[PDB]
């Protein structure tokens, strides 16, 4: 394990995020080659092509250990950004930022993931570094700071102008795989435009630190280390995104890029510590820092089949150390696990290690009940990294497969997505064959339907998403009585029940309470729970619009029975009908899912954000300023949040991001309740 | 992937092994080799772990069963061994026979399950094939006959010597998943040791059949088919256990073992026919053969939740064939069921099938009142595959939430009919009834791992009962409460006697009223009142059983007498008559069966007698001793831990209800004192 670094400052866990056909595969291939041929030159103690096969590949660049993670490019990407400490964003110079990159960039923005940009395909016709860097501002609202400029356009691409050390690194002519660059003076053709972007970089660098601002403004020139260190601080704080260029296919620009990963991307020490919750006690927060002294905690993010080893579990260790053959707890499942062989996968070999320490990524063998997203931890000090509890779905969509083969494909999609997403719920009515999926939002459901149709090729009719409304009562209704007297064939059925129905808060979140005040055996004790079950069964339905009834307290006050005719079945009918009777007379109301929306926007677009939120019946809660940006917190009904992603992006020209969580159910306004009821009665 | 109708080409088997022995890695390799090799610089997932997985090896259908989780829960292990036709025993070459693998071996011995042995981890340092085969004889009393010999030791492990075909199958270098072997001649280093074990195998084969004994002794050499056929006969009869070796992690030896399952493990035709009983007629025996022509019979052995399909019931069909959308009867419950979609689960898909035929294992959909252990059968020829089990719980535990925040537990889940939930009303006081102390502990883990409740668990309490021993006559009670609005009146005179009943019934009500002295309108109310009072005790608050109430006389007021007043009268008169009929407390007596290693048997009988046990039999099965005894459940508390320490973890115990017996005098006073202490 001497090959695994314990100095986490010299470790970098990063991945490549890019649009498809942008060059992620070819860039990773070139990274792995250049890093191999430059490793232990004259220090090895003592044709070839690199393909990427492992989900995580470990390599070394200039005395730093680089753990590269294959980002799919969904819930899987959200997990990978937690496994990532930083990312390299690869763009196609012909197109700049593309619709796919927008989504991942905003998720990395949510989790404050430092990024550096590599504009690829600079050899191709139509590729432009300057146009592409514009699209980063226009569509991502990103402070993209070019740290280099291209030397040449289309076929004449030869290298890059280094804007930190003012020199040019050129690969002239047909460049061999792994061939180094020639360091030359900046060409005269580029001298002024280089000086313009040098000023832009120096101004950003000088404004970060007061000591350099006094130094820069005084006419003194900033040192390379001061410039380099300032860019790193800003990049790690997600303040700026350094931009590079090259041609991975033409073998131009890879080596400066690798330097940028070392120079400006964060180590396990630079990112904030891992925050999780105790196994139980979700509210209790547990924090695990990136040091071997802390208790062991690790997240499993990929399950794979190795051509030699069989089933392989990839894990990201955030804190502490564990050894091979030692027991750990799968905190997500509460089951014990024993770590088998431990590996760090290299480009062309499998490096076995004897223990799994903090800040590193490993492939584990002997795991039996660990799934992607599960947390492995010290048995004595247990942490769960992902939240285990989720509220019931608030939006539902209906899917009906077209053919009997689409039904079988839908059953293999609901199985693989269950493994990846525990947040979504599925139920199937075998009559009509209507699979209804519950989700956490319209976009969450929109993702699942797409993955069913593109990654699993289902052909089905998708319904329009329906908000999961509920019903409750606002008033106390007293001495509501119902009598069931059905004379079925032969012997009849009898049950009389008198209940008292009131709203019920639930101190700890309870939705229902049943109380029996029956005195003197007027209702036999054996029949009391049948009234409860009958009331609860009738609660499944609704008195107003057919939506479930919640926050009710049923008080069984009295009743009557015939010794022969009364049965558990009869007292369940009585409970059912009496609940429908009392709820109708107790001011029934409809409840709406309310969302806790938080929007981070620049000041200039903040007014346009609050105006949009007000139009969605939102209630503004806060107007904070965090990290030079303004954060608006508001409660918005989920019913009004349809299409927020596109509307926010249009109104704020792409510079604002948002997070939606469930908050509570609230009574629907009067004018909106009648619209809900009218639609439901017609459905 | 079609469904085979030639049941000779079918293998219903499972893997039994100690923990960390390689069950998961061997199952992984089986599923890969059977898929890619027969009917890579890669990485992928199918994320499927089915209770029963159907796969194919060389034109034979292999149905693999997941071995039960709770090894000490004897109801789960016996069910799976009934679903199994044969088993593959996986051992660690470094450790040989281990305590948990010993327990299942003796259980498989009880149920006559043919077994083959696979010595795994032969590439690990300290692994010895011959040491493991010695432990098979010393600790399992098993005629373990090696049909293979290891080629290499520890890191130099390369393959196996086949002792039937007398060749060597070697996997040289780093073996990829599914990589084939090279069949080579036995190395000279192993030629002598191979011939020694070849003679041992030939002698076992030759003594089986007289014809082969003539050929072997005559100097003629036995054919491969003759050796294979003899080993198969001996393996199916549990006379010999073939021994193999390999490395599941290093991908060496998997294909020979799959061959051994086909060659020497039993088919559905080779196992004895299914033996059951007619509903509610334990003495009447019904036999179902492994043929589609016989009436349909199937056992449900696993209930699971499918993400898309909902409830999934895994069934092992022993006899006949039934189609989708056809009705069957759940003989265990007496209710009818309609088979919905039928599935055979594969390593990477769900294969829909049109019928559930004999000798195969399926996943069923549309079942509502079928539980693990229930028997599905043709309505006309009703069979129950599992023996009758006591319904009422014998052990009770109290669970109280928190230390309302943890009322999340609804647990209306069918669970089993074995669990009964009743309320003593102390903070709700969910009291759960079970078949034993381990039974409840299994359920509590479900409530705490699958539902993560925070609760105080009580100490297990024996579910005692009460009864009467003498006849009491002319017991009268008069209910006269003059309430303001309306008064109430009811007089009843009853006769109370003990009543076992030819039908096994707990209660009998007879009315000998002569005139309309008690109106016919209120007779059923008196019966209900007596039954209500029987739920509670007269001595220590435990339910009363085996009572007969005879209503002899009474009185009524035309206005004041109601059904309620006579229910109070019937109730109070039973509490009064039972007190005067010599009430006694009854305790559940259990049929305990302990399978113990050779050495520790003596401590078992002494312990059982110290727990007020009555020894009934000792038998010798294989190399172990089986002690059967009748022991009161009250004295069996903590037996698992005491036996496991006493037998170094190598022994098995079974507890099933047997009968109720009167509690001894000094123990009756202890029970009563606690209850009166409330
Ligand atoms: N001319 C040119 N072609 C490139 C470059 N990078 C990638 N390509 C080509 O683009 C195609 C897709 O690139 P690929 O690595 O598969 O992108 P990915 O799908 O995002 O992983 C491949 O055929 C490459 O040959 C580049 O820098 N210049
Ligand atoms: N070296 C070696 N290790 C093995 C072999 N078979 C299993 N293992 C390892 O033993 C550990 C436990 O095996 P496992 O399949 O989980 O056994 P189980 O607990 O009974 O299911 C795992 O980490 C396996 O990788 C083998 O043939 N050789």
CB B611 within 8 A of CB B501: no
Question: Is B392 annotated as ligand-binding?
Answer: no
Q: Please tell me the distance between residue A356's alpha carbon and the centre of ligand 2 in angstroms.
A: 19
A 480-499 → B contacts, CB under 8 A: none
What is the four-CA torsion angle of A288, A292, A293, A294, rounded to 10 degrees?
20
User: The tokens of B78 are what?
Assistant: 């016996």
Cα angle A351-A352-A355, degrees, rounded to a multiple of 5: 130
Q: Which of B394, B468, B464, B498 has the alpha carbon at shortest distance from B670?
A: B464
Q: CB under 8 Å to A525, separation ≥6 — which residues?
A: B532
Q: CB under 8 Å to A183, separation ≥6 — which residues?
A: A167, A168, A169
Q: Is A424 helix (H, G, I), strand (E, B) or coil?
A: coil
Considering only CB atoms, B307 lies closest to which of A54, A426, A520, namely: A426
What is the residue whose two structure tokens read 């008690």? B518
Other Cβ atoms within 10 Å of A51 Cβ, number: 11
Q: Is A667 helix (H, G, I), strand (E, B) or coil?
A: strand
Backbone angles phi, psi at A430, to 5 degrees: -65, -25
Helix (H) or strand (E) holding A361: strand A360-364
Cα separation, B92 vs B97, in Å, equals 8
Cα separation, A584 vs A235, in Å, equals 61
Other Cβ atoms within 10 Å of A520 Cβ, number: 11
User: The tokens of A328 are what?
Assistant: 């750990």
Q: Please tell me the distance between residue A367's alpha carbon and the centre of ligand 2 in angstroms.
A: 10
User: The tokens of A548 are what?
Assistant: 């479930």
The DSSP 8-state label assigned to residue A514 in this structure reads: E
What atom in ligand 1 is closest to the CA of residue A28? 15
Q: Do A426 and B251 touch (CB under 8 A)?
A: no
What atom in ligand 1 is closest to the CA of residue A121? 27
Cα angle B125-B127-B131, degrees, rounded to a multiple of 5: 150
What is the four-CA torsion angle of A178, A183, A189, A192, rounded to 10 degrees?
120
Chosen for mutation from B42, B43, B155, B340 (greatest number of chain A CBs closer than 10 Å) is B43
The dihedral region occupied by A320, where left means phi > 0, alpha psi between -120 and 50, and beta the remainder, is: left
CB B376 within 8 A of CB B363: no
Considering only CB atoms, B177 lies closest to which of A307, A411, A435, namely: A307
Question: Is B69 annotated as ligand-binding?
Answer: yes
- Which of chain A's residues have a Cβ under 8 Å away from the Cβ of B486? none
CB A75 within 8 A of CB A54: no
Cα separation, A48 vs A31, in Å, equals 14
Q: Exposed/middle/buried for B185, CB within 10 Å: 0-12, 13-18, 19+?
A: exposed
**What residues pair up with B620 in beta bridges, in sequence order?**
B625
* Reported resolution, Å: 3.0
CB A248 near ligand 1, within 6 Å: yes
Does the beta carbon of A431 lie under 8 angstroms from any beta carbon of chain B?
A: no
Task: Count A/B contacts: CB-CB distance under 8 Å.
Answer: 98
User: The tokens of A542 are what?
Assistant: 């609704």
Cα separation, B340 vs B367, in Å, equals 8
- The number of residues in chain A equals 683
Cα separation, B74 vs B80, in Å, equals 10
What is the residue whose two structure tokens read 């990103």? A142
Which DSSP string corresponds to B574-607?
HHHHHHTS-EEEEEEEEEEEEEE-STTHHHHHHH
Does the beta carbon of B402 lie under 8 angstroms from any beta carbon of chain A?
A: no
Considering only CB atoms, B308 lies closest to which of A53, A334, A414, namely: A414
What is the residue whose two structure tokens read 């999961």? A468
Backbone angles phi, psi at B549, to 5 degrees: -100, 130
A 278-337 → B contacts, CB under 8 A: 280, 303-312, 333-335
Considering only CB atoms, B47 lies closest to which of A51, A416, A508, namely: A416
Q: Which of B509, B557, B559 has the alpha carbon at shortest distance from B533?
A: B509
Q: Is A661 helix (H, G, I), strand (E, B) or coil?
A: strand
Does the beta carbon of A434 lie under 8 angstroms from any beta carbon of chain B?
A: no
Q: Where are the alpha helices (DSSP H) in A38-125?
A: 75-83, 99-110
CB B326 within 8 A of CB B357: no
Cα separation, A411 vs A431, in Å, equals 16
Helix (H) or strand (E) holding A24: helix A24-37
CB B124 near ligand 2, within 6 Å: yes
Cα separation, A481 vs A499, in Å, equals 6
Cα separation, B350 vs A413, in Å, equals 12
Q: Which of A548, A550, A574 has the alpha carbon at shortest distance from A561?
A: A574
Domain ranges of chain B: 1-272, 273-391, 392-464, 465-587+659-678, 588-658
Q: Please tell me the distance between residue A413's alpha carbon and the centre of ligand 1 in angstroms.
A: 30
Cα separation, A69 vs A92, in Å, equals 20
Pairing, β A342-345 against β A350-353: antiparallel
Cα separation, A588 vs B116, in Å, equals 68
What is the four-CA torsion angle of B375, B377, B380, B386, rounded to 10 degrees?
-30
Backbone angles phi, psi at B191, to 5 degrees: -65, -40
Backbone angles phi, psi at B77, to 5 degrees: -70, -40
CB B387 within 8 A of CB B282: yes
Cα separation, A454 vs A19, in Å, equals 16
Cα separation, B38 vs B55, in Å, equals 9
Helix (H) or strand (E) holding B620: strand B614-621
Q: Do A408 and B350 touch (CB under 8 A)?
A: yes
Does the beta carbon of A411 lie under 8 angstroms from any beta carbon of chain B?
A: yes
CB A523 within 8 A of CB A566: no
Helix (H) or strand (E) holding A579: helix A568-584
Sheet holding A342-345, edge to edge: A335-338, A327-330, A375-377, A297-306, A310-319, A360-364, A342-345, A350-353
- Which of chain A's residues have a Cβ under 8 Å away from the Cβ of B126? none
Q: Do A522 and B42 touch (CB under 8 A)?
A: no
Other Cβ atoms within 10 Å of A509 Cβ, number: 10
CB B372 within 8 A of CB B429: no
The dihedral region occupied by B280, where left means phi > 0, alpha psi between -120 and 50, and beta the remainder, is: left
Considering only CB atoms, A428 lies closest to which of B42, B309, B567, namely: B309
Q: CB under 8 Å to A344, separation ≥6 — which residues?
A: A3, A4, A58, A350, A351, A352, A353, A360, A361, A362, A363
Q: Which of B510, B595, B597 has the alpha carbon at shortest distance from B549?
A: B510
User: The tokens of A254 are what?
Assistant: 């890879």
Pairing, β B297-306 against β B461-462: unpaired
Cα separation, A443 vs A658, in Å, equals 13
- Which of chain B's residues have a Cβ under 8 Å away from the Cβ of A54? 43
Q: Which of A328, A324, A307 has the alpha carbon at shortest distance from A364?
A: A324
CB B384 within 8 A of CB B278: yes
CB B342 within 8 A of CB B353: yes
The residue whose CA is least distant from atom 23 of ligand 2 is A366
Cα separation, A126 vs B605, in Å, equals 91
Other Cβ atoms within 10 Å of B66 Cβ, number: 17
Chosen for mutation from A56, A57, A305, A382 (greatest number of chain B CBs closer than 10 Å) is A305
- Which of chain A's residues have a Cβ under 8 Å away from the Cβ of B307? 414-415, 418, 426
Q: Which of B449, B353, B439, B367 has the alpha carbon at shortest distance from B396?
A: B439
The sign one gets for the Cα dihedral A388, A389, A394, A399 is positive
> Crossing angle, helix B210-217 and helix B188-208, to 10 degrees?
140
Q: Which of B539, B531, B402, B401 has the alpha carbon at shortest distance from B469?
A: B539
Cα separation, A447 vs B365, in Å, equals 29
Q: Is A502 helix (H, G, I), strand (E, B) or coil?
A: strand
What atom in ligand 2 is closest to the CA of residue B90? 20
The sign one gets for the Cα dihedral B157, B159, B162, B168 is negative
Q: Which of B524, B525, B606, B11 has the alpha carbon at shortest distance from B267?
A: B11
Q: How far is Cα of residue B676 from the mean position of the Cα atoms in its chain?
A: 38
Half-sphere exposure of A392 (CA within 13 A, CB side): 9
User: The tokens of B622 are what?
Assistant: 């294989």
Other Cβ atoms within 10 Å of A158 Cβ, number: 24
Q: Please tell me the distance between residue B517's alpha carbon and the centre of ligand 1 in angstroms.
A: 102
Helix (H) or strand (E) holding A429: strand A425-429
Question: Is A452 annotated as ligand-binding?
Answer: no
Q: CB under 8 Å to A102, separation ≥6 — which residues?
A: A139, A140, A654
> Can you state the percent helix, strand and coil of chain B, rounding each to 5?
25, 35, 40
Please, which contacts does A516-519 make with residues 24 or more away whose CB atoms are closer than 8 Å?
Answer: A516/A555, A516/A556, A517/A555, A517/A556, A517/A557, A518/A556, A518/A557, A518/A558, A518/A559, A519/A558
Pairing, β A360-364 against β A342-345: antiparallel
Q: Chain A: nearest CA to B555, how far in angstroms?
A: 19
Cα separation, A654 vs A646, in Å, equals 9
CB A120 within 8 A of CB A91: yes
Longest Cα pair distance anywhere in chain B, in angstroms? 109
Half-sphere exposure of B626 (CA within 13 A, CB side): 14
Cα separation, B112 vs B114, in Å, equals 6
Cα separation, B524 vs B505, in Å, equals 18
Cα separation, B461 vs B587, in Å, equals 12
Strands (E), B403-556: 420-423, 430-434, 455-457, 461-462, 465-468, 472-482, 487-498, 507-511, 547-555
Sheet holding B144-146, edge to edge: B52-57, B60-65, B10-17, B86-92, B115-120, B241-245, B144-146
Q: Which H, E and C letters describe A294-315, residue by residue? A: CCCEEEEEEEEEECCCEEEEEE
Determine the residue of chain A that is closest to B345 in CA distance.
A412
CB B477 within 8 A of CB B491: yes
CATH class of A471-592: alpha beta
Other Cβ atoms within 10 Å of B382 Cβ, number: 20
CB A365 near ligand 2, within 6 Å: yes
Cα separation, B304 vs B50, in Å, equals 9
Cα separation, A338 vs A379, in Å, equals 11
Chosen for mutation from A306, A310, A314 (greatest number of chain B CBs closer than 10 Å) is A310
Q: Please tell me the distance between residue B567's alpha carbon and the centre of ligand 1 in angstroms.
A: 88
Pairing, β A552-560 against β A629-637: unpaired
Cα separation, B21 vs A209, in Å, equals 60
CB A117 within 8 A of CB A243: yes
Question: Is A375 annotated as ligand-binding?
Answer: no
Cα separation, B481 vs B489, in Å, equals 7
User: The tokens of A529 are what?
Assistant: 């729970």
Other Cβ atoms within 10 Å of B323 Cβ, number: 12
Backbone angles phi, psi at A679, to 5 degrees: -65, -45
Radius of gyration of chain A (CA): 31
The residue whose CA is least distant from atom 6 of ligand 1 is A23
Pairing, β A297-306 against β A167-170: unpaired
Q: Do A304 and B349 touch (CB under 8 A)?
A: no
Q: Please tell me the distance between residue A120's alpha carbon and the centre of ligand 1 in angstroms.
A: 9
Q: Is B497 helix (H, G, I), strand (E, B) or coil?
A: strand
Sheet holding A493-503, edge to edge: A477-486, A493-503, A552-560, A512-516
Cα separation, A494 vs B421, in Å, equals 26
Radius of gyration of chain B (CA): 31
Which DSSP string corresponds to A518-555?
--TTSS-GGGHHHHHHHHHHHHTT-SSSSPPB-SEEEE
CB A247 near ligand 1, within 6 Å: yes
Q: CB under 8 Å to A309, separation ≥6 — which residues?
A: A341, A343, A350, A365, B249
User: The tokens of A500 are what?
Assistant: 């008292």
Q: Do A307 and B407 touch (CB under 8 A)?
A: no
Cα separation, A216 vs A239, in Å, equals 20
Question: Is B21 annotated as ligand-binding?
Answer: yes
Q: Which of A311, A335, A366 to mutate to test the pocket of ligand 2 (most atoms within 8 A of CB)?
A: A366
**Ligand approaching nearest to the C-alpha of A327:** 2
Q: Please tell me the distance between residue B126's alpha carbon and the centre of ligand 1 in angstroms.
A: 51
- Which of chain A's residues have a Cβ under 8 Å away from the Cβ of B350? 408, 411-412
Q: Which of A599, A623, A621 has the alpha carbon at shortest distance from A612?
A: A599
- Which of chain A's residues have a Cβ under 8 Å away from the Cβ of B17? none
Distances (CA, A) of B90 to B56, B100, B115, B162: 21, 12, 10, 19
What is the residue whose two structure tokens read 């997990």? A79
Q: Which of B419, B394, B399, B423 has the alpha carbon at shortest distance from B409?
A: B399
The dihedral region occupied by B628, where left means phi > 0, alpha psi between -120 and 50, and beta the remainder, is: beta
Cα angle A290-A144-A126, degrees, rounded to a multiple of 5: 125
Pairing, β B241-245 against β B144-146: parallel
CB B467 within 8 A of CB B543: no
Q: Do A435 and B309 touch (CB under 8 A)?
A: no
Cα separation, B459 vs B445, in Å, equals 15
């Amino acid at each position: 394990q001497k090959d695994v670094l314990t100095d986490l400052s010299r470790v970098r866990n990063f991945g490549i995020m890019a649009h498809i056909d942008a060059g992620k595969t070819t860039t990773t291939e070139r990274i792995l080659y250049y890093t191999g041929i430059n490793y232990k030159i004259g220090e090895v103690h003592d044709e070839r092509g690199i393909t990427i096969t492992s989900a995580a590949t470990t390599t070394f660049w200039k005395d730093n250990q680089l753990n590269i993670i294959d980002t799919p490019g969904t819930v899987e990407v959200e997990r990978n950004l937690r496994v990532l400490d930083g990312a390299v964003a690869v763009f196609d110079g012909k197109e700049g930022v593309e619709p796919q990159s927008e989504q991942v960039w905003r998720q990395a923005d949510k989790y404050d993931v430092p990024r550096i940009c590599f504009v690829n395909k600079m050899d191709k016709i139509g590729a432009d570094f300057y146009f592409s860097v514009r699209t980063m501002g226009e569509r991502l609202g990103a402070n993209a700071v070019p740290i280099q400029l291209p030397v040449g356009a289309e076929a004449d691409f030869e290298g890059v102008v280094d804007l930190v050390e003012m020199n040019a690194k050129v690969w002239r002519g047909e460049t061999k795989l792994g061939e180094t660059y020639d360091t030359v003076e900046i060409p005269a053709d580029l001298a002024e435009q280089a000086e313009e972007y040098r000023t832009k970089l120096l101004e950003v660098v000088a404004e970060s630190d007061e000591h350099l601002l006094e130094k820069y403004l005084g006419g003194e020139e900033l040192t390379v280390d001061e410039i380099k260190g300032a860019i790193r601080k800003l990049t790690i704080a997600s303040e700026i995104y350094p931009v590079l260029c090259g041609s991975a296919f033409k073998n131009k620009g890879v080596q400066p890029m690798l330097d940028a990963v070392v120079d400006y991307l964060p180590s396990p020490l630079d990112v904030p510590p891992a925050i999780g919750h105790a196994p139980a006690k979700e509210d209790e927060e547990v924090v695990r820092k990136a040091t071997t002294d802390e208790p062991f905690a690790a997240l499993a993010f990929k399950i794979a089949t190795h051509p030699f080893f069989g089933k392989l579990t990839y894990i990201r260790v955030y804190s502490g150390t564990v050894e091979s053959g030692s027991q750990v707890i799968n905190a997500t499942k509460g089951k014990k696990e024993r770590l088998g062989k431990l590996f760090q996968m290299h480009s062309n070999k499998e490096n076995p290690v004897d223990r799994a320490s903090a800040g590193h990524i490993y492939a584990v063998i002997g795991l039996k009940d660990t799934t992607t997203g599960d947390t492995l931890s010290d048995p004595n000090q247990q942490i769960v990294l992902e939240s285990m509890t989720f509220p019931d779905p608030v939006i539902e969509v209906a899917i009906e497969p077209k053919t009997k083969s689409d039904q079988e494909k839908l059953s293999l999609s609901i199985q693989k997505l269950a493994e990846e997403d525990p947040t979504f719920k599925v139920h199937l009515d075998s009559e009509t064959g209507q699979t209804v999926i519950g989700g956490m939002g319209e976009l969450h459901l929109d993702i699942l339907v797409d993955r069913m149709r593109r990654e699993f090729k289902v052909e089905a009719n998708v319904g329009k998403p329906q908000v999961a409304y509920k019903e409750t009562i606002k008033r106390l209704v007293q001495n509501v009585e119902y009598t069931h007297k059905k004379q079925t064939g032969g012997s009849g059925q009898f049950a009389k029940v008198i209940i008292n129905l009131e709203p019920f808060t639930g101190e700890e979140g309870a939705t229902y309470e049943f109380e029996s005040k029956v005195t003197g055996g007027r209702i036999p004790r054996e029949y009391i729970p049948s009234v409860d079950a009958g009331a609860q069964d009738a609660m499944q339905y609704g008195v107003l619009a057919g939506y479930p009834l919640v926050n009710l307290k049923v008080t069984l006050l009295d009743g009557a029975y015939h010794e022969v005719d009364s049965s558990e079945m009869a007292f369940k009918i009585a409970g059912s009908q009496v609940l429908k009777k009392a709820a109708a007379l107790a001011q029934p109301v409809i409840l709406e899912p309310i969302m806790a929306v938080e929007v981070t926007t620049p000041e200039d677009y903040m007014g346009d954000v609050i105006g949009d939120l007000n139009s969605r019946r939102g209630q503004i809660q806060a107007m904070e300023e965090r990290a030079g940006a303004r954060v608006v917190r508001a409660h918005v009904p989920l019913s009004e949040m349809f299409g927020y992603v596109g509307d926010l992006r249009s109104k704020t020209q792409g510079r604002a991001n948002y997070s939606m969580v469930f908050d509570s159910y609230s009574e629907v306004p009067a004018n909106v309740s009648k619209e809900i009821i009218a639609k439901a009665t017609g459905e």
